[PDB]
Symmetry: D2
Subunit: 412 residues, 4 copies
């Protein structure tokens, strides 16, 4: 009755749902917003209840087991991206970690797209590699044959437990073909008799502009720190997808103590009331700023924004799995680090930081920050050049952001 | 340097300013958002500094340590949003209105008021300050400059006219007060009497985005930040904007009566104001479409008291010159009475039954049995409150869903 | 069932009640602490439900929907701490005091006051409410029932005596008002004039743990919860406790003038009250030791205005009768006037130089140039606030560290 | 200057340090308490600053704090000060702190030595999750016997590298002890025989940081559930790891890689909590002694009381006298009537809350065999002294006469 998804047959819009879904005000004194349970300690009505509770939590008896504020966030997040279930954690990285800890074992192999968020690559290549997990890279995320080849290469060395992709990629907005990935995992399953669990890091576009569950992806992972929170003021992670898989992640979250805290949960609920509004606004502005960059009167720059990438295969994937371009993109100045540094330092409205998806616009130079630990050769092959600048557009007016970039070109 | 109003000469848009104006990250270790000072106790660097501090605060020596850091940011941004010189924020809309009354009224003073006012303001005037010796005089017709002058003259017959307090648009009919005509009548009053009543506008329904009384010579605006500016039906807060010297007297009262906003709510306000432009324009967009749909719905003809649907010539001339949008709170009148209104409201799924307004969620109420049930029938008539009138305050939900909910209500109550 | 005041017939101690009184965990999903309602907007289940609510608010139908959930717990516990029938919390100490003056004063009314008062209170009386037509009359000697009766008589010469407003112990001298004698003087006043002034005690310095004015017939107590009850110099709030009918009138003013405490601060207050007994007794213990060391310090003979060190007979009989501890705020007087007092305060490293009191950290200030610099010099001097006087408010630091800090200040000054 | 540890030569007491250590008010506008940075995003003053930052963050250039959140840093300085450690890192929970230690040091094939019984959550991490990643565990039979500690180390080394010696003392719920000095000497002898040294880790939640400082006894690292005594108000979740700088640095790197930092708001609550941690832990300990003494002599039923002050054994008391300066406030007592009697007793209480946490302001009670220790097999449970009649209480700040009256009522109704 408080999980109503439709009205007279037509489904409700997400922005409507984020004000009530999963919360019954009259079970909380009529409060129109959910109260914050700033505690993790809930007492039992009896010792018999306490024993009964632990019988169920442990599985000694078949199925109160969720924090009230986390449950509302999880219900609303899964609704936003079309998933059966969701679990929220203390951070994007602890959400990704819980997935790896839930499913990987020594001897396991995983397939990954390239490039991944640096912290994810660190978990795979440093920590889990040392725990006996092998990783195999997809050569070209737009080539289904390359996805299948990576799956076969992984299967040669052990069980392929996970197929973990991140699309669009940072900072070039390169894409992974989700439908092609699903079909390659279907053929793999037909050949080997088991199916790798598919996971998509959906932070850049989701949950509003991309829903991996609509493309057969088993789980999506989010750094709620970015767009969903959207105010650069809370850290949180989320995992959405099929109920049985999310249940294993929830078990790991509880075992490794990775729960999101109640106060941040209250901020997330507040944030989710404007997530539709904020993400569409930021994307509209970023679209305008990108088009202005692509034809600016100062200096020819390459603009790696999804609407400006002309390749046929790219656009076929984009049209099929994305409903907007997000608000994070990069452009490439002529010249190297020196020009990019002078450009960034001339801006007044973009703040120099490595985060993304805030109410304020952010800017950084990946080669000297997010990607400074990668060798210069591997940066160049990944398209991260010394002239590349990444912006994450916020809620400022497009005319002010454009005027800010205009001033930077002149003063550089 | 932390108060930049323009870029290469052109002024920055308000939505751009709400992410930086009045805050320098590098005086707070680069934090891109202001830290929260959850304290009101700030130590002195020396006993001499403390003595110097109290010398200045009291006026013993002529002149920001005199403002809480988080309140200062909210006030700078709020004044920027509505074009004012200065602002002071309080614990609530009612304590902001109170501070204005306490700062300027004295025994024997008279005030001019528009009608109807928020119930809480009317209680302050008619119960508390009347007992303290303040007389009030009502404007008969807020669209008539002659009626404004007459109320001012009637007030001046009884004593000094200290305040001219108006509220536009009015709740629940969205009736208007002609702010430019009030300015001209106050100009003529000042020419005749040699003093000028301070003018104040409760700007909660439309401000600060869709109406800026300071652009019309109104001395001060007062706001319930609890409504639109906060916008998420959590924090409670008030704001007063206007001329710096008047705001300073209001600020002095705020300190003496201890009605400062708390820091945690200030941090919530700062967060809210990062989306206030977007939220208010979206809510107004949906309300305009919902109002237009009500006006031609196929179930039953209803009067719709939304500013864009009120055809009177004088009203529209006032609306066009002092408003840039219609807000998102409006009323419509069903045929029949309380019984039909109750069946309509109870059939809705997306509107919550509450008396607040300007939240992210859409709200609905029946004023005759709630907000205006304690007033005599005469006061209901003067506010346009009949038993069939229903007031909605549109939130951020999609207009197609709100319309479907209202369409369903007509069918299930008809 | 959740307002249980005793166990096996015997009443529960206050520190026990601060962990449960007025809260049923099983009405909140078993949560052992009350959830925070960060909203003031509560919806009705139906349009009829809304009409019924306002029927009750307006008195058309006789009568918790009429209180915020977190403020109600704070108020229940606060009234419990000081033995009052009822309580109402506001945004600040000053808005709580204001609510009292706005609830009861009218043009022409007179009030009786003790001296000295908190500076902010003195400003409300002598500036704002005087301009609204209220006169004030001072008790010359708070230990003298004759002086209390005299002020009441002087007040009635000019108009109705609506309030008898006292603050005991006084800030910063710890001067006392004889509360039992005040009640008896008001009884005799009522016999002569046929009406009784409402008595109010600002109970911030000692309450609610070390003094309960309701046990001495005081009609209302007012608190700056910003001080001891909050105790962490991180929230601002006020409270009024006392007779149910009087608190109800203050509450109506609180709502009409928009002085509600916010929910987040209410949650912090609930958290704070779980240690208010513990914190106030610790600070009081430490202050006794620090005052005793000051009274015999090895550097300079100084007068110490701490309740345990003021030897006067009338003082101690009043103190023993109405106080169960001495608090942690007190003053001492240097010989070197303002110049030496400034050198002393500036040499300290552990006491923070600030005007607040009753925090976890120890505080120090010079009242003649700060807290009481707004009072005319004559009234300041006549109340014992002298240029050499230094006020300390002891926190939770170890007494040996505070003494070492004061010892260093004597040397470096 | 903001990290001053002494005054005129004598070191400041911990309750004094918890109000100032690691914070300079005049770098925060005189605020007497630290402001809350409710953000993790800190901007660079220049592109060159950003490149320099990552030069250091990656270890390409050494540090010449920009690399710690302001509020977490104050908590970490104060925690390390309280327990005498060189360094500290705080995480989102006790379990994420314990996990970070395991993830920083364990590899497939590694062995660890553990005390018994451990917290149920720790036992699950070892026996389920890290067992499946290839880690073996070996239990110390008698924590008071140095021979038993060395035997466990030798047994572990037969099967692979002994990476960790992980103990929890006093143990939950029996208050059984690990001889920490004897453990250090056994690790010395182990190191002499094998040429490598397991890292020693002590879960110090029940007594620390006030009543036990493992760093004073050669323990390499302590781990805390700050959720219990340090927070102390049953309203925040947090973990802490303290110890040697090089080891904490490796734990900190794991914390960052696995995203388990504590959030800013909980850090601000922790700072507030630590201002009363000495007062609260000493008070709870006083009450616990009085309640335990009353239980040992109650007129209703002879019960065994497992409170450190009531355990008469010579070896136990020598260990306790040497490494503890107090008994904490969590302890157990054993009824005769097994689970059925334990349940009737617990259900009869009015002031103790039936819950599994410990170290709150409210006193708590639970039955470990069916709750906290129900996930460990019954054989391992029974050998660790967790029996069907055992009841665990955690004393809070209530007055002892009220808790005693409450337990008295429970005995009668049973």
């Amino acid at each position: 009755s408080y999980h109503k998804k439709d009205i007279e047959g037509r489904p409700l819009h997400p922005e409507t749902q984020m004000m009530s879904y999963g919360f019954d005000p009259f079970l909380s004194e009529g409060a129109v917003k959910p109260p914050v349970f700033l505690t993790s300690t809930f007492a039992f009505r009896s010792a018999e209840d306490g024993a009964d509770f632990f019988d169920i939590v442990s599985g000694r008896k078949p199925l109160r087991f969720n924090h009230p504020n986390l449950e509302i966030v999880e219900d609303r997040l899964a609704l936003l991206d079309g998933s059966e279930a969701a679990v929220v954690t203390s951070s994007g990285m602890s959400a990704i970690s819980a997935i790896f800890l839930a499913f990987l074992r020594p001897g396991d192999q995983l397939v990954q797209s390239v490039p991944l968020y640096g912290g994810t690559e660190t978990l795979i290549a440093k920590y889990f590699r040392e725990w006996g997990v092998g990783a195999h890279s997809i050569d070209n995320g737009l080539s289904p044959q390359a996805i299948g080849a990576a799956l076969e290469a992984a299967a040669q060395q052990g069980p392929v437990r996970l197929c973990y992709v991140e699309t669009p990629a940072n900072p070039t907005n390169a894409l992974i073909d989700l439908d092609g990935m699903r079909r390659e995992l279907d053929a793999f399953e037909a050949r080997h008799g088991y199916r790798p669990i598919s996971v998509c890091d959906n932070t850049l576009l989701g949950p509003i502009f991309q829903k991996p569950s609509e493309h057969g992806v088993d789980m999506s992972v989010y750094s709620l720190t970015k767009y969903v929170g959207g105010h650069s003021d809370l850290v949180g992670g989320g995992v959405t997808g099929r109920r049985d898989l999310v249940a294993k992640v929830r078990a790991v979250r509880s075992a490794f103590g990775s729960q999101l805290d109640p106060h941040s949960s209250w901020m997330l609920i507040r944030s989710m009331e404007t997530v539709v509004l904020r993400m569409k606004q930021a994307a509209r502005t970023a679209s305008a700023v990108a088009k202005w960059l692509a034809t600016n009167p100062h200096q020819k720059v390459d603009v790696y924004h999804p609407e400006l990438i002309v390749d046929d295969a790219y656009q076929a994937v984009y049209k099929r799995q994305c409903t907007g371009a997000g608000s994070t993109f990069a452009f490439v100045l002529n010249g190297g680090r020196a020009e990019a540094f002078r450009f960034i330092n001339a801006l007044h409205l973009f703040k120099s930081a490595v985060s993304l998806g805030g109410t304020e616009s952010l800017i950084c130079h990946p080669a000297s920050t997010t990607h400074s630990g990668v060798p210069e050769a591997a940066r160049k092959a990944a398209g991260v050049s010394e002239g590349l600048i990444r912006v994450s557009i916020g809620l400022e007016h497009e005319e002010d952001l454009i005027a800010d970039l205009d001033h930077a070109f002149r003063r550089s």
